[PDB]
Scaffold this active site. Structure first.
Site, PDB file in Angstrom:
ATOM      1  N   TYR B 103       1.043 -17.009  -7.049  1.00  0.00           N
ATOM      2  CA  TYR B 103       2.311 -17.350  -6.418  1.00  0.00           C
ATOM      3  C   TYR B 103       2.324 -18.844  -6.074  1.00  0.00           C
ATOM      4  O   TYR B 103       3.385 -19.423  -5.782  1.00  0.00           O
ATOM      5  CB  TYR B 103       2.719 -16.428  -5.260  1.00  0.00           C
ATOM      6  CG  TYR B 103       3.178 -15.033  -5.652  1.00  0.00           C
ATOM      7  CD1 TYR B 103       4.343 -14.884  -6.361  1.00  0.00           C
ATOM      8  CD2 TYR B 103       2.463 -13.876  -5.349  1.00  0.00           C
ATOM      9  CE1 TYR B 103       4.827 -13.655  -6.753  1.00  0.00           C
ATOM     10  CE2 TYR B 103       2.942 -12.613  -5.726  1.00  0.00           C
ATOM     11  CZ  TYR B 103       4.125 -12.509  -6.441  1.00  0.00           C
ATOM     12  OH  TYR B 103       4.653 -11.301  -6.858  1.00  0.00           O
ATOM     13  N   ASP B 165      -4.702  -4.779  -2.696  1.00  0.00           N
ATOM     14  CA  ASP B 165      -5.762  -4.789  -3.684  1.00  0.00           C
ATOM     15  C   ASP B 165      -6.916  -5.649  -3.198  1.00  0.00           C
ATOM     16  O   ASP B 165      -8.071  -5.260  -3.362  1.00  0.00           O
ATOM     17  CB  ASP B 165      -5.223  -5.258  -5.045  1.00  0.00           C
ATOM     18  CG  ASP B 165      -4.319  -4.217  -5.731  1.00  0.00           C
ATOM     19  OD1 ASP B 165      -4.267  -3.059  -5.257  1.00  0.00           O
ATOM     20  OD2 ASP B 165      -3.718  -4.513  -6.796  1.00  0.00           O
TER      21      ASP B 165
HETATM   22  C1  LIG Z   1      -4.950 -12.433  -7.157  1.00  0.00           C
HETATM   23  C2  LIG Z   1      -4.336 -11.128  -6.711  1.00  0.00           C
HETATM   24  C3  LIG Z   1      -3.204 -11.139  -5.892  1.00  0.00           C
HETATM   25  C4  LIG Z   1      -2.625  -9.947  -5.452  1.00  0.00           C
HETATM   26  C5  LIG Z   1      -3.228  -8.714  -5.821  1.00  0.00           C
HETATM   27  C6  LIG Z   1      -4.353  -8.696  -6.651  1.00  0.00           C
HETATM   28  C7  LIG Z   1      -4.924  -9.890  -7.094  1.00  0.00           C
HETATM   29  C8  LIG Z   1      -6.151  -9.862  -7.975  1.00  0.00           C
HETATM   30  N1  LIG Z   1      -2.870  -7.538  -5.247  1.00  0.00           N
HETATM   31  C9  LIG Z   1      -2.267  -6.818  -6.345  1.00  0.00           C
HETATM   32  C10 LIG Z   1      -0.774  -6.985  -6.208  1.00  0.00           C
HETATM   33  C11 LIG Z   1      -0.201  -8.215  -6.494  1.00  0.00           C
HETATM   34  C12 LIG Z   1       1.169  -8.378  -6.356  1.00  0.00           C
HETATM   35  C13 LIG Z   1       1.963  -7.310  -5.943  1.00  0.00           C
HETATM   36  O1  LIG Z   1       3.298  -7.473  -5.815  1.00  0.00           O
HETATM   37  C14 LIG Z   1       1.387  -6.081  -5.657  1.00  0.00           C
HETATM   38  C15 LIG Z   1       0.020  -5.918  -5.798  1.00  0.00           C
HETATM   39  C16 LIG Z   1      -1.947  -7.563  -4.252  1.00  0.00           C
HETATM   40  C17 LIG Z   1      -1.579  -6.333  -3.590  1.00  0.00           C
HETATM   41  O2  LIG Z   1      -2.079  -5.241  -3.862  1.00  0.00           O
HETATM   42  N2  LIG Z   1      -0.476  -6.403  -2.748  1.00  0.00           N
HETATM   43  C18 LIG Z   1       0.149  -7.612  -2.461  1.00  0.00           C
HETATM   44  O3  LIG Z   1       1.077  -7.600  -1.653  1.00  0.00           O
HETATM   45  N3  LIG Z   1      -0.231  -8.753  -3.029  1.00  0.00           N
HETATM   46  C19 LIG Z   1      -1.272  -8.770  -3.891  1.00  0.00           C
HETATM   47  N4  LIG Z   1      -1.632  -9.940  -4.508  1.00  0.00           N
HETATM   48  C20 LIG Z   1      -0.971 -11.200  -4.117  1.00  0.00           C
HETATM   49  C21 LIG Z   1      -1.763 -11.897  -3.021  1.00  0.00           C
HETATM   50  O4  LIG Z   1      -3.101 -11.419  -3.062  1.00  0.00           O
HETATM   51  C22 LIG Z   1      -1.182 -11.563  -1.654  1.00  0.00           C
HETATM   52  O5  LIG Z   1       0.223 -11.785  -1.652  1.00  0.00           O
HETATM   53  C23 LIG Z   1      -1.853 -12.363  -0.538  1.00  0.00           C
HETATM   54  O6  LIG Z   1      -1.827 -11.592   0.665  1.00  0.00           O
HETATM   55  C24 LIG Z   1      -1.216 -13.739  -0.314  1.00  0.00           C
HETATM   56  O7  LIG Z   1      -2.114 -14.635   0.336  1.00  0.00           O
HETATM   57  P1  LIG Z   1      -2.349 -15.154   1.850  1.00  0.00           P
HETATM   58  O8  LIG Z   1      -3.541 -16.049   1.875  1.00  0.00           O
HETATM   59  O9  LIG Z   1      -2.292 -13.997   2.783  1.00  0.00           O
HETATM   60  O10 LIG Z   1      -1.012 -16.056   2.078  1.00  0.00           O
HETATM   61  P2  LIG Z   1      -0.797 -17.651   2.328  1.00  0.00           P
HETATM   62  O11 LIG Z   1      -1.403 -18.429   1.210  1.00  0.00           O
HETATM   63  O12 LIG Z   1      -1.179 -17.974   3.732  1.00  0.00           O
HETATM   64  O13 LIG Z   1       0.802 -17.733   2.176  1.00  0.00           O
HETATM   65  C25 LIG Z   1       1.798 -16.913   2.723  1.00  0.00           C
HETATM   66  C26 LIG Z   1       3.148 -17.468   2.325  1.00  0.00           C
HETATM   67  O14 LIG Z   1       4.097 -16.930   3.281  1.00  0.00           O
HETATM   68  C27 LIG Z   1       4.552 -17.948   4.147  1.00  0.00           C
HETATM   69  N5  LIG Z   1       3.712 -18.047   5.340  1.00  0.00           N
HETATM   70  C28 LIG Z   1       2.364 -17.842   5.433  1.00  0.00           C
HETATM   71  N6  LIG Z   1       1.887 -18.039   6.639  1.00  0.00           N
HETATM   72  C29 LIG Z   1       2.996 -18.415   7.387  1.00  0.00           C
HETATM   73  C30 LIG Z   1       3.168 -18.763   8.749  1.00  0.00           C
HETATM   74  N7  LIG Z   1       2.174 -18.794   9.646  1.00  0.00           N
HETATM   75  N8  LIG Z   1       4.412 -19.081   9.163  1.00  0.00           N
HETATM   76  C31 LIG Z   1       5.410 -19.057   8.274  1.00  0.00           C
HETATM   77  N9  LIG Z   1       5.371 -18.747   6.979  1.00  0.00           N
HETATM   78  C32 LIG Z   1       4.127 -18.432   6.594  1.00  0.00           C
HETATM   79  C33 LIG Z   1       4.460 -19.228   3.339  1.00  0.00           C
HETATM   80  O15 LIG Z   1       5.657 -19.428   2.615  1.00  0.00           O
HETATM   81  C34 LIG Z   1       3.236 -18.989   2.452  1.00  0.00           C
HETATM   82  O16 LIG Z   1       3.510 -19.533   1.206  1.00  0.00           O
END
Ligand SMILES: *Cc1cc2c(cc1C)[n+](Cc1ccc(O)cc1)c1c(=O)[nH]c(=O)nc-1n2C[C@H](O)[C@H](O)[C@H](O)COP(=O)([O-])OP(=O)(O)OC[C@H]1O[C@@H](n2cnc3c(N)ncnc32)[C@H](O)[C@@H]1O
Ligand SMILES: *Cc1cc2c(cc1C)[n+](Cc1ccc(O)cc1)c1c(=O)[nH]c(=O)nc-1n2C[C@H](O)[C@H](O)[C@H](O)COP(=O)([O-])OP(=O)(O)OC[C@H]1O[C@@H](n2cnc3c(N)ncnc32)[C@H](O)[C@@H]1O
Ligand SMILES: *Cc1cc2c(cc1C)[n+](Cc1ccc(O)cc1)c1c(=O)[nH]c(=O)nc-1n2C[C@H](O)[C@H](O)[C@H](O)COP(=O)([O-])OP(=O)(O)OC[C@H]1O[C@@H](n2cnc3c(N)ncnc32)[C@H](O)[C@@H]1O
EC number: 1.1.3.38
Lengths: 555, 555, 555
Positions: B103, B165
């Site tokens: 993303y 995941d």
């Molecule tokens: C690499 C990967 C990703 C993944 C996976 C599996 C793998 C191998 N699983 C499978 C999946 C993927 C996509 C979907 O749709 C379903 C399933 C995931 C899973 O099972 N379920 C998910 O929901 N996502 C999965 N993903 C994607 C990824 O792993 C997750 O989305 C993570 O949780 C994202 O990373 P994280 O470090 O938590 O987020 P960060 O980089 O901090 O960014 C968050 C974004 O939201 C806003 N935001 C964040 N923090 C704030 C604060 N404090 N205030 C305001 N806004 C905030 C920002 O816009 C930021 O960009």
């Protein structure tokens, strides 16, 4: 048409007249009713509501009141009026049904406003889809209708509603109001997916996936945006992409909603309603510590509700038909009444859903659960009298709309309901602790406490049902006092109301004062940006366009 | 500190320097990392993410990039920077984790922006309450942590998470992103109740019941608003009173979230994970018509997911470890692979929850359900190999965080995931119909289709998993083409994506064009009103402050 | 006068009335026609057009419609109304002729607008100068008139027009529309030199050399600017000095044009029209690779046009008079028709100009050129039947205005033409490639493909002629679908339309989306600056004054 009894703010008579004129010049003389003289005295009925004001009137009857009413015939209509309300700065008071009784009904927060009777002509069941298990409706679709619609399309055997105590309200309005119903589809607002609204600038909007447009096709060419069908996913997924704005649309004045996607509950394949009578007033306590993990474990299916004896009793007959005593009833006459009826002090209704092998187990755990409560007794509608409340509740816990509970609105000769509804944790303690407070004041009020704890999954809505005589100024004032009083205490204890009559929106919004009204303020900013002019329902949820004196306006 | 490689818009170097200076002058030199030279080349790892950019880089690596990064130490900190970002019009890019990989990760939409590493110092589990069955967390709380927190407080036996995941992401970030997880508490966003955010003006806000303040008490006197406890009902009921604004807070740029209330799932008293292998690629069709009413009837408990063989396979080994063939794999080698593994073409995982008498029945109906599919085969983790995906999924469907799925990110030597995620109805037809499209292009792309349909209750999320080599410019371009291409088709068919990488937010938001961008427009208006200056994450969800050229900015 | 069926935006009835009143109070009751009731149903004729709406109606007939119409009697008049339109913010819809049929006719983009019938009273041939070989005209001068003017002044022997397929249109309007005609003076817009327009502020302007004022003289004293003669060079050189702004004046809404300088073609001293019938549908391909270098070498004189058989056939009789078959005609019945007529599948008309020694050579090269095409056959009007299309085209390729082509508007009982007109390269491939697409859809549409490639010198205008029944809602929708569909494909392939009906201006302008609407945006900025109020023809070429909701307005 010429001289309503009340003008909205800064409005000139000529202007009203011009405004009102162009409006007739579109929706038809049929669609407008100008409020020229007090002969409006006509409060109504639940059967055919008055839109001019507050039927159950707490303030001056005439206190919150329309300047006139308008039945927009179609969305474009709504759009045009918005234009006019904007041209003249005449503000609007949109309503689907009229039934927001015990909350104000059709009465506009600001008097001299325009009541937008949306449901009059916009009565359509736009759609019901089985595979999706949802329907799409206009404001005007009351619950009974939504139901008869199913009956006449033989769908009952496949999909089911979720009604509130009453059959008549707007399925749509109730949802934006965040109303409540009985089955597992009880949380109305949460059951919506895809909505449509005429924002303040008069521009149309459809939410979530409603924004993703249905692909083009020869048959859909040239239809107003309003009449365009929706995308496939529109009503099966509420979110869409990026900011989830639907909520700005519930209990706010951010827009005029024309349509909405409501999820339907697929006939479950097994249903069993019941009662578990609670003997002691204090049983209410342990029952909750009880009900608590069952609901969270989902052993508890729909929304459990635990009724106070009188609710049932009142559903049963007037207060007089039980004790000609101007003062409120003794802790003792209740028990006597509790017995006269075969009920408890506290009365828990619910239902089991689906395949009997699972219903069977559930009931064991429940029946088995409430057993620690002595004198506890279980029943199925069959195990009870014909006038039985449980009878009605069975239709109820299964989407079948009644009208019988209204009768409790009758306890006192001039009946007018009003409800106080602090929200409290699912904790017998807290429940008890809350209640004490509530009742105490009802006392002080010369009032019969009457109420119930509907159980939310992790919170509990305590609905204090205040009937009161709409013609006894002494009592009404007592009620206002009571109200505003309870509000203060509740908050003193950390419990907020979640819904309220017109006359308290403010006091209510102010309780929510963390970090200095930080929230109210934020809101205002948004209302401003979007309704630069304040035409749309100013004062709702106690939110006011800067065009409005908080000084001249609050209460 | 002096000369980052990229300035935000209209910014002077001196200004950057002053801005950057005052910032060091508060959060400590420790809290800031200035991006002075390309030696940033350091992409990262999943173990310790780079915040400067997009690890899996599709555009120029250096395309979306920070000017510097800042670790606010506490809310007040966040507040001060907001002030500075406002003083200088330096905009911010807030992130909890860093993991938004596939993303964009920590890369800011607008380059030269300030990355606000929120999670660095704000790692706290503020609270976990059992009776409420919820927890409260800071951005920095990753899922593993939230978990170990339970373990070390012996709570596991009473409350459970819901992981995606992967184990590492921010519980908090994932929720605002509207992420997804496996148990019945799979819908992350929906599991929140009460949040807190530093709005753009630097002012703090707490939502819903979070607005109703905890009553005063000797022990709570004089604590910054930030540190004040919450009201009782704060985290057990999300709504509050009047406009429900939380949603403006998810996948938007309306604010910087500091904390959040997440519901915890009470240990259910019985759990059974499994697999139902699907033999033919076309089985995917009937399976859905199958899965459909079970989920709606709730026979289907958590979120069903139906995996494509390769996902599992890739989880299993690299593509090479299966067929040194630069082109994508033949319909045939799959089957061969499908057999090599004991899986199907399609692979449905799930879990049963609670008391065995009910788990037992459910399974009957399911097992019994999928029987119309020939060659169907059922399994429990035990009935499978040690490297088994189902093994991991069992921990998964029960809140236990893994890290094993990452390995699929490895299929191609330079692995970089990217996901396309049109949402489609729970209809085998539509599912199939969707897929066809998706795959066809992956073809055209020189791409192995790889994906899965996680089942929403009334909609279905098709996650196309595109790995691709982060160093092969030819392929990456192929991917961009593919992407933007798929986006167009999907919408052509009425399916929207619900989440996306930085580089497509726009194209994505534009699909949502009903009635002329009516929605986007509305949004803009709100972002404007609230972030008059555009400092907060401009370009997110493709929403841009007027300070931003849609011309210079979109893609 | 009092209550038109449609108000423009934000307009009050009284205002309309006042506005409309002052207007009668100047142009005479004779000059205004107020549109009070649906009895407007009267669509018209080509002989005497309706100005209220779209004759060939695709959307609701009543969809795009005037509030009233006004015949300004003289420029000053136009100026005053502009003033009023500005006083009241009533916007205008200026038209010369009424004939923009197949594009919308007199129907205003925005309904409730004021139709400015400019040609009614402003019918003058201001001048025709032989030595300059040009004329100066008012909107009202139709082509026939401009012609008869020559006849009655015996000028025919010295100067010649350049007409479009039809005789009746405004020479002036057609030019600003960038219309097309047959001789070497075919490019209308390009044949203009010096124009005059009432800009939005009501101020008059004359372009290019029109700005350089005619020196003073006793005879010219005191004439309104409007009536002042022009400078010598005014109409012989279009540029003037500094920014060449004429173009802001064509197919835009930057102004109301009152007059224009049109170059006349000096009788050439030799003329020979003809036909070269093409046998196979695929001949269309090689013919183009053929026609290509001849036009560039100028061997090709006027604008070559290559007609599809049916055009001619339809010019010839109704579809029914050829095959009572609701579905479209078979590849086979054409050939049969192609033979019934002595034409080809493709039918190339042209003309030779000037001294025979050169005409002679040219023809050799051409005749000689098209010889590589088998079954090719050449003709002179004489070598053909009396009803012969070529007959008409001879008058045509020589400035003589016909009216006969209209008959093709008759193919289907309720005839309404509409034209799709992607522009494509002069490449047989591309030509073919384009066509395929076009036809395919006409198919899908239940439509007879009917069209022609007029050859531009380095580009080619493919005019898809869509007749359709103005009373069959099913078909019309089919047409809208078709339209918007073709638009998408064409652009998918890189071909833009260059002109279009009201109902698609938007979709059309959006195709032109390089670098994010960069162009549209620029335009808007200019329209803004100059028509601060949006009175002048808002929505044209899909350009909208900020006073207009793109949300409420686009399509
Ligand atoms: C690499 C990967 C990703 C993944 C996976 C599996 C793998 C191998 N699983 C499978 C999946 C993927 C996509 C979907 O749709 C379903 C399933 C995931 C899973 O099972 N379920 C998910 O929901 N996502 C999965 N993903 C994607 C990824 O792993 C997750 O989305 C993570 O949780 C994202 O990373 P994280 O470090 O938590 O987020 P960060 O980089 O901090 O960014 C968050 C974004 O939201 C806003 N935001 C964040 N923090 C704030 C604060 N404090 N205030 C305001 N806004 C905030 C920002 O816009 C930021 O960009
Ligand atoms: C009298 C009564 C009321 C009642 C009862 C029982 C009785 C006897 N049951 C019991 C109850 C009561 C309160 C609570 O909290 C729980 C249980 C109800 C029930 O079981 N569940 C409920 O949710 N409510 C119950 N109520 C209250 C009342 O019956 C319902 O709230 C009705 O549904 C309200 O009436 P209705 O006619 O549907 O609404 P309307 O008058 O149109 O007003 C809706 C308000 O919302 C906004 N709004 C409405 N339409 C629009 C449109 N089109 N656009 C935008 N906003 C709109 C307005 O602000 C309007 O004021
Ligand atoms: C029905 C038909 C139309 C047609 C045909 C043949 C038939 C049977 N031939 C064949 C053709 C068609 C399209 C194309 O591209 C090529 C060939 C035409 C032809 O050979 N060449 C053409 O250029 N057009 C042909 N058309 C279309 C139509 O016949 C012509 O375009 C007419 O000349 C248009 O009608 P007219 O009455 O002259 O125009 P009017 O209704 O007044 O509108 C002009 C528009 O321009 C702007 N405008 C007009 N007047 C003003 C003034 N005074 N100020 C400012 N703007 C003005 C307005 O926006 C108005 O809408």
């Amino acid at each position: 048409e010429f001289r309503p009894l009340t003008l909205p703010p800064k409005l000139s008579l000529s202007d009203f007249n011009e405004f009102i004129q162009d409006i007739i010049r579109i929706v038809g003389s049929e669609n407008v009713e100008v409020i020229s003289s007090k002969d409006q005295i006509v409060d109504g009925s639940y059967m055919k509501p008055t839109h001019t004001h507050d039927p159950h009137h707490v303030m001056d009857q005439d206190y919150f009141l329309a300047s006139a009413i308008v039945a927009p015939r179609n969305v474009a209509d709504v759009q045009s009026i918005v234009g006019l309300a904007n041209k003249f700065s005449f503000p609007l008071w949109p309503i689907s049904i009229g039934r927001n009784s015990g909350y104000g009904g059709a009465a506009p927060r600001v008097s001299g406003s325009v009541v937008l009777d949306m449901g009059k002509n916009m009565n359509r069941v736009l759609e019901v889809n089985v595979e999706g298990a949802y329907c799409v409706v206009e404001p005007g679709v009351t619950y009974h209708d939504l139901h008869n619609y199913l009956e006449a399309n033989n769908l009952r055997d496949k999909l089911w509603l979720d009604v509130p105590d009453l059959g008549g309200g707007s399925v749509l309005g109730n949802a934006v109001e965040r109303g409540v119903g009985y089955t597992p589809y009880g949380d109305h607002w949460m059951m919506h997916s895809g909505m449509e609204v005429v924002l303040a600038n008069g521009e149309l909007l459809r939410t979530g996936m409603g924004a993703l447009p249905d692909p083009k096709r020869p048959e859909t060419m040239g239809l107003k945006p309003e009449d365009q069908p929706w995308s496939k996913i529109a009503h099966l997924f509420p979110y869409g992409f990026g900011p989830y704005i639907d909520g700005l649309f519930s209990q706010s004045n951010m827009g005029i909603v024309t349509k909405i996607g409501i999820w339907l509950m697929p006939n479950p394949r097994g249903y069993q309603s019941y009662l578990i009578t609670l003997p002691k007033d204090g049983d209410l306590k342990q029952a909750v510590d009880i009900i608590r993990p069952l609901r969270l474990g989902m052993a508890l299916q729909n929304v459990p509700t635990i009724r106070h004896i009188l609710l049932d009793a009142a559903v049963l007959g007037d207060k007089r038909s039980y004790s000609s005593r101007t003062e409120p009833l003794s802790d003792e006459e209740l028990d006597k009444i509790a017995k006269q009826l075969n009920l408890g002090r506290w009365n828990f209704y619910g239902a089991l859903y689906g395949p009997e092998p699972i219903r069977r187990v559930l009931w064991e755990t429940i029946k088995d659960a409430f057993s620690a409560i002595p004198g506890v007794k279980f029943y199925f509608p069959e195990d009870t009298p014909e006038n039985s409340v449980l009878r009605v509740r069975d239709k109820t816990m299964q989407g079948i709309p009644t009208y019988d509970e209204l009768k409790w609105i009758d306890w006192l000769p001039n009946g007018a309901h009003l409800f106080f509804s602090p929200i409290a944790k699912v904790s017998g303690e807290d429940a008890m602790m809350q209640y004490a407070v509530t009742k105490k004041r009802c006392q002080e009020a010369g009032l019969d406490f009457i109420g119930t704890f509907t159980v939310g999954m992790r919170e509990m809505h305590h609905i204090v049902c205040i009937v009161f005589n709409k013609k006894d100024l002494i009592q009404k004032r007592k009620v206002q006092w009571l109200m505003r009083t309870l509000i203060d205490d509740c908050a003193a204890n950390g419990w907020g109301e979640y819904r309220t009559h017109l006359a308290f929106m403010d006091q209510i919004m102010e309780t929510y004062n963390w970090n200095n009204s930080s929230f109210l303020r934020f809101n205002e900013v948004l209302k401003n940006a979007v309704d630069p002019n304040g035409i749309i329902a100013p004062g709702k949820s106690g939110v006011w366009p800067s065009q409005y004196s908080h000084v001249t306006w609050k209460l």
